[PDB]
Amino acid sequence: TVAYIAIGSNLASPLEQVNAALKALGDIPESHILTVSSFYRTPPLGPQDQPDYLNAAVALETSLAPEELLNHTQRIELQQGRVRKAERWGPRTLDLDIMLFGNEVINTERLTVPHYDMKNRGFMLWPLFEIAPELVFPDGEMLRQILHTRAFDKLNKW
Known about the structure:
It is built from 4 helices and 4 strands; from the N terminus they run E-H-E-E-H-H-H-E. The protein is α+β, with helices and mostly antiparallel strands. Monomer.
C-alpha cells in the first residue's frame, strides 16, 4: 500500500522542524519512505502575519491501520513534533495528516482518508502534485482535476 502524507511547519528553521517528521514518517512501522515532494513556501495570511508555510507531500508505504497510521503521524507531531525553548518547550509545529491511504475511502468519525481538507486548499495539493500530479483520489477525484478547476496559485520551494 501507500499513504500520501503532508508536512507543515510554522517555523523558520533550515528544515530543522521538518527533519523530525521526515525521518519519523519513514520510522512508522509497516512502512518506509517511498516518496517525498519538495518543500514549498506559501505567503502569509495577509492581514495578520503567517510564517513560511512550508507545505510538502509524502508517499509512505504504510500498511498499518488508517487510524493507527493517523495516530503514528499525530504521535510524531506531538511526541517529536514540538519545538524546544529552555525549560518550557513550545507548541506543536510539526504537522502530518494522512492525505490519502492507497486507494480506499473512510470518512469516519475517527478516519478520513480522502483528506477532507486537501481537495479545497492551495497549499496542500501542490506538494502532492509534485509526486502525483495525476493523483486519482480514492473517490475518483483527480489532484490535477482540482488544481485546474481552481487554478490555485503555485507556491515557491522553501
